[PDB]
Scaffold this active site. Structure first.
Site, PDB file in Angstrom:
ATOM      1  N   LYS B 160      37.872 -31.824  25.221  1.00 50.78           N
ATOM      2  CA  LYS B 160      38.220 -33.169  24.761  1.00 50.78           C
ATOM      3  C   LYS B 160      37.473 -34.178  25.622  1.00 50.78           C
ATOM      4  CE  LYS B 160      42.056 -35.579  25.603  1.00 50.78           C
ATOM      5  NZ  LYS B 160      43.522 -35.800  25.698  1.00 50.78           N
ATOM      6  N   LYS B 162      36.543 -38.294  26.393  1.00 50.97           N
ATOM      7  CA  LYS B 162      36.980 -39.664  26.217  1.00 50.97           C
ATOM      8  C   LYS B 162      35.934 -40.508  25.525  1.00 50.97           C
ATOM      9  CE  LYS B 162      40.908 -39.239  28.437  1.00 50.97           C
ATOM     10  NZ  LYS B 162      42.231 -39.341  27.767  1.00 50.97           N
ATOM     11  N   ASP B 191      39.196 -38.937  22.499  1.00 51.50           N
ATOM     12  CA  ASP B 191      40.407 -39.676  22.852  1.00 51.50           C
ATOM     13  C   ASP B 191      40.020 -41.081  23.246  1.00 51.50           C
ATOM     14  OD1 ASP B 191      42.802 -40.641  23.948  1.00 51.50           O
ATOM     15  OD2 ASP B 191      43.125 -38.870  25.186  1.00 51.50           O
ATOM     16  N   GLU B 217      42.081 -38.847  19.166  1.00 49.08           N
ATOM     17  CA  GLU B 217      43.376 -39.103  19.784  1.00 49.08           C
ATOM     18  C   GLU B 217      43.532 -40.567  20.151  1.00 49.08           C
ATOM     19  OE1 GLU B 217      44.346 -36.077  22.512  1.00 49.08           O
ATOM     20  OE2 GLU B 217      45.664 -37.311  23.764  1.00 49.08           O
ATOM     21  N   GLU B 243      51.430 -39.343  22.700  1.00 44.48           N
ATOM     22  CA  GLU B 243      51.686 -39.340  24.131  1.00 44.48           C
ATOM     23  C   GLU B 243      52.320 -40.637  24.636  1.00 44.48           C
ATOM     24  OE1 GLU B 243      47.485 -39.932  26.202  1.00 44.48           O
ATOM     25  OE2 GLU B 243      47.410 -39.183  24.131  1.00 44.48           O
ATOM     26  N   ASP B 266      55.497 -35.215  24.236  1.00 49.25           N
ATOM     27  CA  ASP B 266      55.305 -35.051  25.671  1.00 49.25           C
ATOM     28  C   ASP B 266      56.689 -35.133  26.309  1.00 49.25           C
ATOM     29  OD1 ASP B 266      54.783 -35.368  28.406  1.00 49.25           O
ATOM     30  OD2 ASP B 266      53.065 -36.718  28.058  1.00 49.25           O
ATOM     31  N   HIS B 293      50.774 -33.587  24.723  1.00 53.46           N
ATOM     32  CA  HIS B 293      49.985 -34.252  25.746  1.00 53.46           C
ATOM     33  C   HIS B 293      50.436 -33.873  27.154  1.00 53.46           C
ATOM     34  CE1 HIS B 293      49.784 -37.628  28.659  1.00 53.46           C
ATOM     35  NE2 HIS B 293      48.504 -37.571  28.345  1.00 53.46           N
ATOM     36  N   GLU B 315      46.377 -28.650  25.923  1.00 57.18           N
ATOM     37  CA  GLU B 315      45.563 -29.419  26.846  1.00 57.18           C
ATOM     38  C   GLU B 315      45.561 -28.795  28.236  1.00 57.18           C
ATOM     39  OE1 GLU B 315      46.622 -33.631  27.155  1.00 57.18           O
ATOM     40  OE2 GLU B 315      44.500 -33.979  27.609  1.00 57.18           O
TER      41      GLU B 315
END
Ligand code: CL
Ligand code: CL
Ligand code: CL
Ligand code: CL
Ligand code: CL
Lengths: 360, 360, 360, 360, 360
Positions: B160, B162, B191, B217, B243, B266, B293, B315
């Site tokens: 993943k 950013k 994300d 995300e 999350e 989460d 998350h 994750e």
């Protein structure tokens, strides 16, 4: 602990009979778990369920750790040859019986009643509603006398009365008479058992505007979401359903459409406690009340309604309770909180002797 | 067993630090349960959470049966003066820590890891995705080297990365470079951490049409359901979020609107394991995947993903694992299945000694 | 002018007490601004709010130009470590207190009351409704006597009465009695404080068809938009809510869904006056009336309702007014228009001496 | 004519085996009708279906006029004790077998093939698509060779290829290779057998944008209408489903939601020909094509597709055809029009001798 | 302070001319406020606006406290004989001029620029986009040269180019050429000025799929919400509009329908700053960006974009700036933050001398 035996059983219990059809699962430590679905007690069809349990599920269970109830749910439900002829109907009802038996084992091994095992009580008293006084076959005279007895002598303040005459005005008359006979503070729900169509229900609900109807259970055909959604928007009378829904997917369809306000999961129709909890959580997410249908005469649901926080009130039909090691019990309209280890699914030994039927 | 002590704690663990802020709950039998939320490790705000635990929740817990985790969730969540300043934020994060501690106790007392307690494993191996190679602060050369190392040396097949530059075309450039560098069989999710608005996201998603993005995300503002719903309909790229959502109610709003495909509860943001399970069941009802998350760096979620049948992948961020009695561990892109009794929330003594902060 | 001091305070004022929990902000010119949220006056939870103000917000405020209230709102609300544990709950309530104090400074520096500062009066008289006679704990006798007094002696023609008995027919009876006791031209709103579920509300609203109910406030769970939307379509009784909503995003969700007709922002729940105005403008855009909830006992809202053109009527509860330098005042059902510089948030000096509590 | 005998049978035919599980119904004139469902050929589950036929349905059929196929459908489907454990699954599959047998009798007594009985042919030639070359178990080289053989040697111009690898990009690779190998005029549909979730399907469909996919069959979970509706709006690739739907109600839900474009009733899954025609008429009303799933290997569906005007093309799998008195036959990609009286459900004696299994 | 004079004015400023048509309002302290709308500079229609100001609004303003800008907005907007011929068009444009003048007075009396008066800056620098290089009248060579000059010499990184040829493929050609000429990091928005219909726009947007279009402004007829909603769902290109909408009501209709992503209020078209803020707050509630149209050539909007937190970027057209006491100024693609007291609406004496037109 390892599963060492899986034995189906059929009880035909007097009210012509209610069928308690299920599984006894034994583990290596000698603990025995019981789970069951509910039927009309016709032997040839009951045997389809027990044959599924013995012939299809038992081989998938023997030797497995009974503790692994979640994993075993999936193992049985998704077994390719079985799900091919399943997802609903007889395979799913047999699954329910196995699932409940596994939960009964888990709680018995833990030495506590299921509501405590699951995390404790959400209320000090689960209120009951009496369905047994409301059958459609009762003459008006008998409907009135039983309703009055339930309220005036037995301390109920919540009743459920059947409707579904070909002409719903007959049901309007019956309900009007009951409303005149009993105190105004008696809550009265009704149940049509899927007998009517949308336009019939629209007219009936309008005609019942002054009868203070608590909910209208199964007004329409069981698999018809849209008619229920349209009816719910057409009347202020709340719609209740779920008795006849086999899956969490069906509940999601009804709930998301606004087709149900009183959500009625049933561990004997859904895939046992496992799938029941999923549906109850779905209802909680929508802030809708969970009022389970008594397909097991509330022997299991008393635990679930003492525990799950979306729960409210609980159906009462006293037909079979005395045949169990821990009968449900209602005093002044409130269910006793169960005490014994397990899910109160264990019949008295004598129940098998007196009411048991050969599975083969 | 009765709760005899409730002690908050704050750890500021190096990666500038991750805040592990929570509660140690002791029962009369000497069992100690741990639960925590995750923060940015700023002491004065961390102390708001611990003060809620010590000053407000402890008096509601002492003397109560820790086994009653469901009843106690409600007791704390609905305490009038607290819910008045709650339903989200500080009080709810403190509730999460308490709830996780009670579940840790439950599994410890049972002598089993939490995934087993809950009903057994839904998979032989939970696959991991590496988030730690993808931070927005990494230069392109460092993003490339780390992505390649995770895949080619460490055996990850899922990453993943950013996004969230002011001009999303910079992110398109970075992702294009990563896609060119690593094998096509590598799954790459992204994300945005709520950085962009709807039109920006529409343009970015169209520009990313050929980059094989696994999910996007938190593309949009956390509390804006409609923008997410509109984005989800405008692109084939799946939307992931959760999350930042505090309640089952918020998840219901997003899920029912078609605003999320990858559901990310989460336990550190929702009200612990208790509320997590409600949300996971909600996702299951919609046949949507649950990918939690890592607000607790997967110490708890490894159990929940090994167990809950809607779970898929998990994750991975390795920052804090070595500070626990049972660190998560990933080999060849697969999480080790936890073995120790409890929810793997118990930190090592060294963590308190080296990184513990005074709560008052 | 530069902020030179930020000092939290807690007052517990008699009606067991109402909590006035907030911030006093001093500028270099000696002007002192006051802002506060409202609580149940439990010291340990009140202190979570004051600790946020002193420990987290004060460092972000000292040295800043207090005139920059918009910029400072964002600085505090979006501070990463704080918004991480915020967007709602205790951080947002602390933000509200700071925001109101900054507006109090702006108006004080300008030498005018806030309604005049904002652009002048939209009406010659803001009409009041009396909530203080309607509490659910009142016996029917006391409900009747107080309602009659408010109308016959004190000149109110608008009341708000609580509902929310387990059986809503008890509330039907109470409201029926009040309607019989007071003149037909008395407007009567009701408030359920989120106690009931959708089906319960549907039945109650139908049963209240002849009671001339002005609005039904918080009929359903606070975070459940869809139930409110369904109820609003099922009855002609208008739905009011907003007391419990922390953000403009939540208001947008309810408003756009048709889930609220009477919009009730509250500067003590939303992020102060700044976020209140955003919500009032949102309501104006929909041509919906703004009737703010008295979380500050209308000390601030009297200004906002004298100014904002979407405003209509204003809640009245007289518990704390006499403890302020400019008490709200109602004569013959109309609020006096404030005269003093500021937002009438300044308590009498003696109020701190008599009712102040230590924040640490 | 009156029904004089009902005899269930089970065939396990080689392709590991296909289960032909059904009923032979004899009438007083000596005519014998055959009908069957399709299973995975596991004896213990097959026997649940046959036991339903012999133990539950036979008593409801003996002595009845077989001509009354519509009335008898209702008699069996709605028999209370049976529908209680039915509406889907085992009982409904057994109902399908009976219903098909009654239609076989009807056409036999009339002396004509079923397509003619029903009102004549809607086309001079029903085109076939080859499914048997496309199994997921085939290596790429075998998928390529078989696809090419079907097209270049056997004269098919329509194929269906399975998808459903855990990573759908493997399926993209396989389909890309087939597209490169065979002429562009070959139509290629795909089938995921309910293996994937919504986000996975969104990504796959976008990746397949240039592969000219004719339809995507069962992309998502069988009972999840909303996911199919969302997918259908997200891609131009048509969605096909129906082979797992038991009732006209389920088809109505999918069709009205825009969740299916290629409607796939199956007389072995729905309640026989009777319910198939209802669904085909529903599809006709929406001007959607009817392409039935080969649960009976097209032995019955060849008639229905030759007749019903919403029909288009027809699945071809050659596994069992040679075991019938009138095998389906495809030449140059076109089905032979049936000639013999009945519904071509009558198996050869050799099939029972070589592959028949004891029902009890 | 009391209003002592209201004097309309008309400027026809060269770029064939831009009309600055407005009001100078004087208060008793000698402060003079200026506000204006923007027109095509045709004297006879300009005079309709000024006549409304002098003949209709002046009598409603003289003697009133200019501080009461909110109350006065309502007094003028709702004056019965005027709103009868208003709610839009001439009367509303004249209202805008008055409103802006009152805000100019407010900020002048406070001694600060308007952005500061309103609560301070939301950004250190408002980025500009250059519209003046993009007129439809420019030949391709001139469009290219000017676009390149703005980017390569003047430091813009954001442009807006007109589209709207009868055949949109000519516009595709022009935009393709600009995209090839300038760096990829240049953002390019487009503007159709309401020239096309829905199908034309659908085709154009699909053809522009690879041109990285930042937004498409006014693609469709100004009062047609549904066409914009349908277009917005048919393309990933964001839709911008608002410059032709007169009321908050119209903005609500477009925003709630998902018909606009980039919201473009204009103080010269809406009822001034007062109504602009309402619309900006509405956009904020939807988390949509506010990018106001330069009907006042950004003289006022520079303040509002420096202040309102939903603001992003700001249109730049340099036609009239040098005629103001505080010209807007853009350097390196960033607007200078205004410094002078007021709303930078005060024109230089030379502008009246050289370009002023008689109002009667
Ligand atoms: Cl209830
Ligand atoms: Cl996944
Ligand atoms: Cl009002
Ligand atoms: Cl076709
Ligand atoms: Cl922008």
């Amino acid at each position: 602990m390892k599963i060492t035996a899986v034995e189906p059983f059929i009880l035909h219990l007097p009210l012509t009979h209610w069928g308690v059809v299920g599984a006894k699962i034994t583990t290596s430590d000698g603990i025995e778990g019981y789970g069951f679905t509910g039927t009309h007690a016709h032997l040839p069809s009951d045997r389809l369920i027990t044959s599924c349990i013995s012939d299809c599920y038992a081989p998938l269970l023997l030797g497995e750790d009974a503790s692994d109830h979640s994993r075993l749910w999936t193992k049985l439900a998704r077994y390719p040859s079985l799900q091919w002829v399943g997802r609903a109907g007889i395979t799913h009802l047999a699954l329910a019986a196995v699932d409940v038996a596994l939960w009964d084992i888990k709680a018995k091994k833990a030495g506590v009643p299921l509501w405590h095992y699951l995390g404790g009580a959400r209320t000090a008293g689960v209120e009951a509603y009496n369905t047994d006084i409301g059958w459609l076959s009762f003459t008006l005279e008998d409907l009135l006398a039983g309703s009055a007895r339930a309220v005036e002598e037995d301390g109920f303040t919540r009743l459920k009365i059947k409707v579904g005459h070909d002409d719903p005005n007959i049901d309007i008359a019956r309900l009007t008479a009951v409303r005149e006979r009993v105190d105004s503070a008696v809550r009265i729900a009704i149940d049509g058992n899927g007998k009517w169509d949308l336009p019939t229900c629209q007219r009936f609900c309008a005609a019942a505007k002054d009868l203070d109807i608590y909910w209208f259970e199964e007004p329409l055909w069981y698999d018809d979401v849209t008619s229920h959604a349209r009816l719910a928007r057409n009347t202020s009378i709340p719609i209740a359903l779920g008795e006849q829904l086999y899956t969490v997917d069906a509940f999601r369809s009804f709930i998301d459409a606004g087709a149900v306000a009183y959500v009625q999961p049933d561990v004997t129709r859904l895939g046992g406690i496992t799938e029941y909890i999923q549906v109850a959580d779905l209802a909680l997410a929508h802030r809708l009340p969970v009022v389970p249908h008594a397909g097991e005469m509330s022997q299991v649901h008393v635990h679930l309604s003492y525990w799950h926080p979306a729960s409210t009130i609980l159906e009462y039909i006293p037909w079979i309770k005395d045949h169990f090691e821990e009968p449900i019990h209602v005093r002044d309209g409130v269910y006793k909180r169960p005490e014994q280890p397990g899910a109160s699914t264990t019949p008295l030994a004598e129940s098998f002797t007196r009411y048991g039927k050969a599975v083969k």
